[PDB]
Structure formats: C-alpha cells, structure tokens
Symmetry: D2
Subunit: 448 residues, 4 copies
C-alpha cells in the first residue's frame, strides 16, 4: 500500500468528531444483533459497557489514537477490542463501513442542524425585536442604491427577517429527510441477517427507515440539500452584511457597530471597520464552494458506493461550523449596533416626496399619466426658484393643476409618506405590526 494514497484514504484526521455517533450507532446495532441471536445477553452487556467506556474516553478527551487508525470507525473498533477481547469482533457482523458512515454523518447532521436552528431563530427573533422597538425610525429606501422613497427602519429589518424565516423553513425540510435511518443497508444489497431496522430506528431516534439499500448507501442528497440551504442562507446574510457595511460608512452615517464587532485605530477613533460584516459576506463564497464541490463530486458517479463520496465530511463540518459562528456573530451585530435617528432622519429629502405628490392627484380623480406630468411639472418650478417642492406656494401649485388644495401640505410629511402603504406587506405602521405578528407566529409553528 502506497504512503501518499494511504494518507488520502485516512479520514481519522478530521472524522474524530463522529466518535460519539459512531458509538451510539454501534450500541443500537449490538442491541439488534442480540435480538437476532448473533450476540448472547452477556456479550451485549460486555459490548455496551465497552462502548460506554469508549464514549467516556472521547468526552474526557483521553482517547488515544493509534497511528494505525485510518478512520474513527477503526479506532473505536480497535479500542473496543483491547477493552473486552474477542467478543468485540462479533459487533461488525453483517455491518458495513458503507452504511455506518452515512448513519454517522446523518446523526451528526441532525444534531448540528438542531444547533444551527436555534441560532437562526435567535437571529430572526433579534431582528424582529428591534423592528418592534424602533418602529418609528424612518430612513430612505433604496433602489439601484439611489434614494427612492421613505420607509420604516423596521420594514428594512423585517425584510431580512422574512428571508431568514424561509431559510428556517427550508432547514426544517432538510432536517426531516436527514432524520431517516440508513443503518442496516449493508455494503449495498441490504443487511443479510434480517436485522430489526425498526428497533434500530427507535434506538437511534430517527423518524423512519431508508427505503432502498443501494440508494441509502450511495446518495448524498442530505449533504447537497444542507449545502443548498446553507448557501442561500449565506446569500441572505451577505445581502444584509452589504446593507449594513454601506450604512455604516461615514458617508451614509446611518449607523455604527459596537466595538466587539468592528476594528479601529487610535489614530482615527472616529472610524470603525465592520470586520464582522465583511467576514459574514466572505463566508458566502466559502459555503458556496462546498456546495459546488460536492455537486461535482457526485456528477457522473455510477452506482453504488464509490470512494469519491468521502469528500462529504469535510464539506459538512466546515459548513456546520461556519453557519454556527456567522449566525451568532450576526445576532450580536444586530442587537448591539447603534443607529443614528438624526442622520437617518436627515437623509430624508423633499425630492423623495415627488411621487407621493403625484399620488395626491390620483386620489382626486386626476388620471395616472396626467398626474405624473403634473407632479413632474411641479418639481421643474420649485427647481427654477431655488426652493424645494414642499416650499413652492399654494398659488404656484394651483397654476399647474387646480386639483392642488391646501391639504397638499400633508403630502410633505414623512410619517404620512409611509402611512400610505397600509396594504398588506407595506411599510405602513399597521402593516409593520402585522408582519411582526406573522413572523412570531411562523416561529412558533416551526417548533411546537
């Protein structure tokens, strides 16, 4: 056996975090083997005790890895043997590395996804809570990154909560396809000892059992799916990071992040670098890379098991750790950032109310195209007098369209600007309250 190739087959270098699930998997199997008559009652006790002690060695961090261990499965098998003797060997009866590895990665993923879920909900929750509290703050809404119209700071925050909520929904969909036991699939044709797979499932807490052994052994859908979910999640987070990074520019002045999530220099204590957000944005590429790699690893592979499939572990681990860290960093950034109502408020400009001005007419029967030209004509005027549109006199307005009354003054108020969007999903106060209620409901659904 070649030196370099052996080092490539060697997963022991990173697959150690699968120690516990590999042990849990073995315990269930040993139980099913005793029920099948492959093990005696006493043997089972010996095995379980052995497996339990091994579990402790890892949790305590005292487990010793022999250079002869190519993977975590070999390590535990070797240990279990030097712990209870020959009897240890009977444990691998009819089992295969092929269905052991998938059972292991799936258990690990079910647990990790459970952890990713809490952080994700915590982020969404954090976003929603500030949307509640800062519901009066208004700032410009952008399109093409050019000030378009006023919107509530909360409508902006909520848009990110809503996207994340979808991420959460997908996470759940992926979580249930992962919650299917693949153990007892053997090398590819199934388990040859009529092993009780139902006992296996309930013992390991899966929701159901894999339908086809060839599929169960060679499919990495659960890996691709998780990656697809993780990548779109990062897209959302990269979009939010981009918004904030920009808003935190001295130019915009909208906000600045706490010191914990930014860096700085004693030469310019008035500027803060949003490292936190830059890191989050960059992880999108990192996670996408993993998605792209596994997809290509799978394209073209014939049935059933192929060594190519070992690339899955490192991709999942890296993604699980990336999301776990980035999600929390995002929650903190959101809860501890400081907006500037002042600058955010001074950002609002009269010119932005021009569209609302055209709406004022539409509400008085004046047709669409006709109102537009009227509103556009009104700007041209104030424009030629060196004054904003909210300033031009009532008489000036009259000359362009008799439709303009004295109430037209109401149009030049930002609170009024946003209150226009009462229709479901709008930036109006009422709509924002509705949304806040809906997200909290959806979060309850995705749990109880």
């Amino acid at each position: 056996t070649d030196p370099i190739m052996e080092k490539l087959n060697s997963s022991i270098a990173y697959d150690q975090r699968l120690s516990e699930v590999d042990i849990q998997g073995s315990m269930a199997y040993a139980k099913a083997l005793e029920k099948a008559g492959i093990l005696t009652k006493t043997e089972l006790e010996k095995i379980l005790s052995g497996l339990e002690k091994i579990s402790e060695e890892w949790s305590k961090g005292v487990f010793v890895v022999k250079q002869s261990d190519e993977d975590i499965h070999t390590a535990n098998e070797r240990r279990l043997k030097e712990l209870i003797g020959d009897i240890a060997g009977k444990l691998h009866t009819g089992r295969s590395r092929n269905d052991q590895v998938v059972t292991d990665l799936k258990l690990f993923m079910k647990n990790s996804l459970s952890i990713i879920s809490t952080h994700l909900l915590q982020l969404i929750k954090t976003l929603v809570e500030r949307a509640a509290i800062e519901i009066d703050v208004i700032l410009p809404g952008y399109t093409h990154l050019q000030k378009a119209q006023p919107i509530r700071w909360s409508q902006f925050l909520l848009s990110h909560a809503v996207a994340l909520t979808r991420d959460s929904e997908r996470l759940g969909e992926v979580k249930k396809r992962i919650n299917v036991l693949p153990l007892g699939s053997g090398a590819l044709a199934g388990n040859p000892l009529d092993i009780d797979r139902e006992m296996l499932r309930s013992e390991l807490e899966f929701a159901s059992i894999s339908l086809n052994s060839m599929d169960a052994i060679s499919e990495r859908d659960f890996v691709v799916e998780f990656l697809s979910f993780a990548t779109l999640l990062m897209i959302h987070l990269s979009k939010m990071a981009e918004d904030l990074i920009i808003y935190s520019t001295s130019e915009f002045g909208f906000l600045t992040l706490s010191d914990a999530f930014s860096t700085g220099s004693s030469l310019m204590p008035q500027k803060k670098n949003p490292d936190s957000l830059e890191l989050i944005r960059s992880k999108a590429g990192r996670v996408f890379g993993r998605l792209a790699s596994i997809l290509m690893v799978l394209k073209g592979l014939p049935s059933t098991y192929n060594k190519d499939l070992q690339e899955d572990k490192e991709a999942v681990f890296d993604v699980v750790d990336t999301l776990t860290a980035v999600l929390q960093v995002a929650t903190g950034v959101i809860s501890t950032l400081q907006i500037s109502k002042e600058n955010m408020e001074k950002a609002l400009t009269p010119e932005m109310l021009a569209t609302d001005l055209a709406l004022y007419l539409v509400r008085k029967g004046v047709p669409f195209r006709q109102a537009h030209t009227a509103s556009g004509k009104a700007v041209h005027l104030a424009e030629t007098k060196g004054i904003t549109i909210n300033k031009l006199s009532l008489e000036d307005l009259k000359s362009i369209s008799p439709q303009f009354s004295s109430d037209v003054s109401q149009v030049f108020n930002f609170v009024n600007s946003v209150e226009q969007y009462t229709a479901l999903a709008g930036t109006a106060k009422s709509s924002v309250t509705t949304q806040i209620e809906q997200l909290r409901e959806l979060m309850k659904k995705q749990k109880e």
Copy 2:
C-alpha cells in the same frame, strides 16, 4: 461608447415573450382591484379587460406583432393596449411598478412550469417502479468501485433510482409551495400606495398566500435559487442513472440495449448503438448546475432592495425549465423502451461473489464473524490453489477448513438464495423489493396530489 449597445442588454423581448399570458393575467387581476379601489370606473374596467383579452388571443394565435421599440414583454403588451383601447389603458400602471410585475409574472410562469415538470417527473418514477415490478426476477451484479460486489435484483437497482427521484419530487413540492405566494402589490419597494386589496389579487391570480414584506418580495430570488437547486440535484440523479445505463449498454457489459429512437448507430456496424439519449441527459447536469451557479453569484453581495442585476433570473429559469421538461421525458422513454439481456446479467454473476455468503453460512451456525470470514478466505485460497471455483470445493476440502461446513453448504452457491438473504426492510430480497414498490406507489399518490 455605446448607448445603443446598452439598450440591447436591457432588451428581453427576444426571450420573455413566453410570459405574455401571465403578464396579461396579472394585469387583469390588477385592473379589477383598481376598480374596487375606485381608480377605475366599472365601464373603464370592462374596456380594459376586453383589451387585455384581445391581446391574449393575439399571442394565443401567433398573430401578435412586436415592434422594434418593444424593450420587453411588458412594454410590448401595454403598447398594444394603448393601441386597442387607447389613452385610457394608461390608468392601469397606477400603483404597481415593474419591480412588482416582474416577480409576479415569473412566479405565475414557474408555478405552471413546475406542475408540468412534476407530471413528467412522476411518469419517470412510475416507469421505473412499473419496470421493477415486471422484471423482479432478474438478477445481476451489484457494483462498488465499478467492481462486482454481490448479486442483487435488477429491480433493486431500478428502485434505488426511483427512490432518489421521489425525494426530487418532494423538494419540487416544497419549492412550489413557496412559489405559490402572491408578490403583486408590493409596489416598487415600499408596497402598493393605494391600499389595493391584495386578497382579491391573490384570489384572481390563484396564489395560495400573499407576500409578507414588500422589500423582500421585490428583491428576493430565493424561489429561483431553490428551483435551480431542485433542478441540479434532480440532474445529478439523472446523470448517475445515465452513467449506469451507458456502462451497462457497452458491449463489454452487455446487460442492455437502448431502443433505436433513443440511440444512434452506423451503417458499417449495425450491431452497434451509441447511447445518445443518456449522453444528452448526463450533459445537462452541468448545464443546469451552471444556471444555479450564475444566479447564486448574481445575488451574492447585492444590497437592498431592487437592482438591475436581478434581470438575469428569467433566462436561467427558462433554460432549466425547458431542459428539465425534455430530459425527463427522454429518460422515461429510455427506461420504458430499453431491452435487457437476462442471459448476460445472470451470466455475469460469479461464484467468487459468494465468498461473503459462505462466511455468513458459518455465522448463522454460530461461528464468530472473524473465524467465519477467515474460514471463507481459506476456502477461497484452497480452491484457488486447486485451480477450481469455490462452489466446486468438495465437502471434505471444506471440512478440512472447518467442520462447521455441513453438506447443506451447497445451498450457498445459488444466486437466488444469495439475494434472498436480504429480507430486512429495503434489502434486495424479493419480499423487500415488493414492499418498496408498494411504498413508492403510495408516495406517488402523495406527490400526485
């Protein structure tokens, strides 16, 4: 220096014309809501609708006519409306914007495309499951590392693909539910400014729910990414199935032959068939994956809310939808019409693949896994040294390796008995494959619904 070339990039009319009917539908739904909102008088309405319907027909009969001024499908339809009805149709744009219209049209279009793709997907699944039911007695080699591992039923192989496809169908449904949400009424960014009744819009357009936030509804393209993720994984599945059949159809394996319609030949080598169909299907995985990749890269780093960049979704969605619709039917064809060679499949099974069963023989007699496995190795080695296959070792020779080998060991050297060992749920044993067929059928019912 290219203002004209700039305009060309914004041009979409060359490919978005398949959106004509969804655009018209969205406009009729909005006009109505515009009347309830009083923006339009009842009469103003009836004339608008009648105008949108004349346009509906113009496309539904290829009689429409685009001018060298129609930037896109929208402009092309509103221009014809200003031409049919007149200066009145202008009151329709009141309230909503292109940012609002765009996603509404794409979601309506995708919803229909998905349902169609689902039918084709389900047909493929039914074809595999059906063929698995009929050829349940066929046995061939099960492979790992493209090497003969152990005997398996040909049906187990077919069902492994059907099972994977079933997950594809489940994802398709999840992606469709998120697409069946009304985005119309979000306006250009902050929502509709006329308190338009969105429920009515939902009802008219037949969406299942209404979008929650106007900013999200206008800037998000999750439904596009998700669709592409579903498509790419589905393609991965199909690429694998194509690869398997390509290999099995080689003269070397000789397990099966594609029908004339899904393959090509040559006058000089009539008995030779190239698996054109399978190669096309396999090559589409990359094509679909690329679309996934492009959209993902297009979305990454974009700030709120709407940005021109999002205009790249249409072309990727159209390509993948057509690709999927064609690929799926071709695969159904291929599986439905290919010819298998029972003789060659069975002939490929060898005694050497039964060494594992030999070891299991001892395990069932109580011998420890290790001892048994070691004994089978010795038997394999002995036969090898005598230059004979293990199914020919005499009983004496076997007992010289372990007395546990009784005269009944002969039963081990039977390929049917080999696959019949796998009765545990999901195995290749006949009872197990039968069970799989019932489970899938019952799944095709939840997916059909």
Copy 3:
C-alpha cells in the same frame, strides 16, 4: 423513428448558424487537401470551391434558406452544396468527421471572436489610462473596509483597475495561442486515414501549428474552459469596478455621476441617476461564471474519447463572447463619459486622515514607530479634548507630546504632501502615477 424530443434536444441549428462562415472555410481548405491527396481532381475541386463560395454569399446577404431537416449548420451547408453542385459534394467528407470538423469551426470562431474582444479590452484599459493622466491632480479618499483610510490620487484608483485589466489582456493572449492550433485532420478519433496534408490545412485556415494527438484534439475542450476562466476573472474585475462606481455615484458619496446614456432616472426626481450600466456589468459576472461552472461539470468524469456531452460547448462560448463584447464596450463608454466632482472629492478629505502622516513625521525625525504612533495618538486625543482638529494643535502642544516636533510639522497637514509621500514605485505620488501611465502604455504596445 428517432424520438421527437430527442430530435429537438439534438438540434443546434437554432444557434450554430453563426458558425456558417468558418464551416465553409474549413470545407474549402479540406477540399483543397483532398485534391492534393488525389481524392478529388482539379475539375472537382473547382466545382466544389465555387459551390461553397456561393453558400458563403447566401449567408452574407442573409439569403440562405434553412429547412426543418437541417439538424445543425454542418448539415445545412452540406445539403445546400449538394443542391448546388450535385452529389459530387459527397466526396468532400472523405476522411473527415463531425468530431474534428466541429472543433475546427469552434476554434476558428473563437480565434476571430477573441480578436474582437482583445480590441475592446485594450480600448477599456486605454480609456482608463488616458483618464488617469488627465485627472492626475485630483485627490480623494482611499478606502479600506469601505472606510476613509488616507488621501489618494483619483488616478491611482483608475489605474488599479487598468492594471488588473491588463493582466486580463495577458491571459487573453495566452488562451488565444492554444486556441490557434489546428485540429482538422484528426478524423473521428484516430486521426485522418488518407494521409491528408495537415500542414496544408494549417496554412489555408491560418492556424499557427497543428494538434499533436488526434484523440486529445477531438475530446479536449481546454480552450473553452480556459476562455471561460479568462472571461470570469475579467468579469470579476469589472464587477469590482462596477461596485466602486455604483457606490461613488451615490447621493451619499456624491463623488461622481454617469452620463444619461449609461444611466436611468425619473422626471419626478431629476437630481438622481440610476447606474443601470454598472449594474448590468456586475450581473454579467455571475452569468459568465455560470458558463464556466457549466462546462467544467460537463467535462468532469467523461471517458475518452468523443462524447455527445461535449455538444454543450457552443452555447456557453457564444453567450460569453457576446456578453464580453457588449459589456467591455459599455464599460469604456461609462468610464469615458462619467463626470467626477473634484469638489466633493477633496471635500471628503479630512484632517483626521492625516493622523497617520503625523507619526511618519516623527519616524523621519528618528522617532521609533512604536513611540511615534503613541505620540500621534496623544495628539488626536488632546485634539478632541480641546474640541479641535489635529491640524490646529500648537507647536507648544505638539512639543509637550514630543520634543521632536518642530515648525515644519505644519507641512504634514496638507493633502498634496500627504499623497506625495508615496514616491516609491507604485505609490500614489504623482511621479509614481506618471511612471504607471507610461508603463501601462508600454504593455499595451507589446500586446500588439
């Protein structure tokens, strides 16, 4: 009996018509070689060449007429020729195959196409370079983490993009060279069986050399992947520049404005332009990357030699060729016609950005950086205390911090002198910029 969908799925006519010309030229070259090989007589060659030149025209004047039987452009032409000069046309295919004829057309098309792209890429670089010389005096903020870091010449900025784009040009050349290798004469996969004169084919089609291995030349698509990698990196550069320009054109930054030609707007908000151009360019980065990912996966895992999978190459090549041609030109237009605001740019220059140079003042005076930094720190510190900008601190005050401060420390508080510190090669000092402009001019001459 072929399946109708299989049929349609195999039709490239819809898009491969643009290969009409190069297909004929390949056929012309091959015919001439068939005459020399004794497969055709001069009389037959003349009749064939004449029938081909006729088809050429039919495409030129857009007169050519395609029929539903035309699966691909190769069939459209071969059929047309048969109609024109009778079944003598059949001989033209002697020893030739779709396999080597299809990759011959693709390289020829790409060679021509790349030639046009080179021109446009060079015109963009030039536009950037010439602008850098003209506005070399302009000074504005330099960003790190999208936060003001220190004064930089505006030209230093334009040039960083020209420099990146020149690397793109260098790659474009390296790719062109490998594309400029004749594949015709490779036959179906084992080579040409008629001892055809490939050197003659090369000379006629004008390639620089001939392919080394028939199998490789028919199965590899390195030339496509490589072109796509070059295009993708180019788009990245362009996407970054786009990002910079979109942000600079924000009301908030106000550093510049785009002409109406490459922008979009509203009659309700005259004082506002949306950078549609720059946004298109950025979006195309993904689009082109998509093609790259596409072909890489199509090729991955494919066996030797020819496979129908390779048919996906054309659509990917055409898309990117057209995308780059359109985008590169638009970029040029955007870069040449945009108007900067020297006022807002210098305005952005604040004394807080000279805190760094204050320390450098001490290091030149001999003060160890560790100490000169903490020194400048006390300065900004005491500066805030007195509620004044560091440029207002008195010599007396500066001395209380470090005796090394003299009357000249006053110069450190000048933007021109701030920038003029970077005279080291590639720095932002005017002399460094001019050296750059000159250097870029030299590179542009050689790559021609």
Copy 4:
C-alpha cells in the same frame, strides 16, 4: 472584542506554513529599512541575526507558539522581541499587514508551484515513457463508450500527456504573474518611506514588482488563476481516472492496478477496487469547489482591502496539498499498472474494420458514398452467410465491387488498420513516435522553468 469573532480571524492553526516566507519577507524589508535610514547598520545585523535564529527554530522544528499568537505574523514578531528586544518594533515601520500578507502568499505559492511543476512533469514523463515502451499494443478506441476503431494503447496514453502538457504550460504562465513583488505597497497608497522596492525585489528573488499599490493589495487574480489551472488539471486527471477505472473493470479486463494503489478483500482476492483513481477523480470536485469559493468571495467587492480576502489562504493550501498528493498517486498508478495485452487484443473485432474496408475502396478511386455503400453491403452479406466480414472470399467481395482485389486481405489486420493514420497526430506508429519526441521537447522547454 467578541469571542466567536476572534476565533474567526484566527489563522494560526493553518497559516504556520508561511513561517519561513514571512521571516524572509522581514529580513528583506529590514535591509530595506537600513537603506531608508530607519535601522542603523548595528540594528540591522541585530535583527537579521534574530530573524535567522527564529527561522532556525522552525527549521529544526523546535519553535514554540503561544495561545496569544493569532497570525503566523504575530507569532514571528512576538518571538522577535523575546530575543532582540524593543528594537524589533521598528520592523513594522511603514509596513502594513496588507502587503505583508500578499507577499507571504506569493512567495509561498511560487515555491509550491515549483514543487507542483516537478510532479506534473514527472507524470507526463511517466506517460510518454510507458507509451514509447508499449508502442506495439493495440486496443479499441472509444466513442460514446462503444468500440469505434483500432488505436494504439500509446495513442491513448499520449492524448492525456498532451492535455497534461498544456496544464504545465498554464502553470508556468501563472507562476510568471505570481513571481512579482507586492511588498512596499503598504496598506493602500504605497510605501510612505520611499522604501527601495528594487532592493526588496532582488532580496526576495522576485522577477519584477507590482505596478499599482491598490491593485497589489486587493487583487487575488493569482489565487484565481492558480485555482483555475488546478481545476483544469483535475478535470484532465478525472478523465484519465474514469478511463482506467472502466478499463480495469472485469468486463473490460484491459488492465489491473498494483496492490499499492488499490483495495481488495480477502474474500475476493481477484476483485481490485481502484481507490487511487477514485480519490483522484473525487478531488476534481474538491478543487473546483475552492475555485468557486474564491470567485464568489471576490465578486462585487469594492476597492481596496476588505477582510473578505482572508479566505484565500485556506483555498490555496488545500489545492496545493491536493495537487501534490494526487499527481504522485497518478504517477504511481500509471507506472505500476499491468496491462493485459491479450485482452486488449481479443477486444479487437472484424466488425470494427468495415470502415477500413470502405477506405480500401476510396484509395482505389471509388467515391466515398459508393465506397461506404459497398462496405455495408459486405457487412450484410457476411451476416446472411453466417460469418464475419474478414471470412468473406474474394469472390464474395468481387460480387459486391470489382475494385476489390486479393490485396484487400490486408484490410483484416489490426496493425495495418492503425498504420493508415500516418498523418500528423494520428495513431500510426511513426506518428506516435513523432509525438513522443515532440512531448520530450515540450517537457524540456518547460523543465527549463
């Protein structure tokens, strides 16, 4: 200072590989600081002495890192003080982490590219040499994975070597741009102390120096290009692996991998699983994944430096180690695999010569169309007569075309088949010989790195 954050910026666990390059970057800068008049000659010798001592520590591998260390950089600085004192602090003078980090990576990549180049050339040499030795072996050439026509085993081996040769040419082109000095660009606007960048260049063995400070700090083209070269190379390797995997199947039986690059069961000692090839093939996805990530990280970023660029190290390290391991595994596989000349021979069939039969007529003046027709008629005749085309008698052939003469007997010989392809790059022996020598020349030009 957040704990998760701090852990995200850490890189000491993986960037230690950059120890020696970092120190070399310090010695260089230190000397440049002495010329700028910041470090007295006495201080220069003081530092250079320490820096060497620390570098000397890593060398013997006795260096020690503390938990306080985050960057391989700070790990070296911290240790500089522990040996030299406060004077160490002057090394930072006018030097940013921005040009210091891009300098370490290029210096590292340049050295990695050299190692990688060597292995690549070793792989090419192994293929070309084996081809020269087994130049007489003939086997089926495949198209759509179906026997298409006789070819020389060496023609097959050479097609891969040729592709691999272009990879080696891409390596050189990439190394060229990597071999440029970025140091002295500072944090963004360049070096502020008029540092002598020509001295740094000479000292760091770079070929030239960066043209623009902003570009040199923010660009990661060099990372992209390298990844692009690696991915194209891995594609090539995945194609070769697919081939060998297929050729090593029992069904094909064309060759067997040595025990060193394959897995096997004691129960089936004949079964040979091509682990080595599968590993190589799977790394293609792993590498492309890296390319994909960095590309998405760079997309849409604004000038100049952004913390995003930090994701480059791990991508480069992964692919550098992967390419190094994979290339050597490839080399091993190709030189230690045993071919079955006999099975490659028995795979050549008479049916694969109908094409040659038509060509026989073409050389005697018969037009392509008619030639192809006579041959096919000969195929039908042998079919109806129950024999193979080579068994048809002269009379059988004459009755199809008078142009057939007793000399047609030579058409039914596989050596003569491949010998028809004498045209440049064809599979005729003389052509294969010409390739071997063209490739040796090419390996020479490149070897002269």
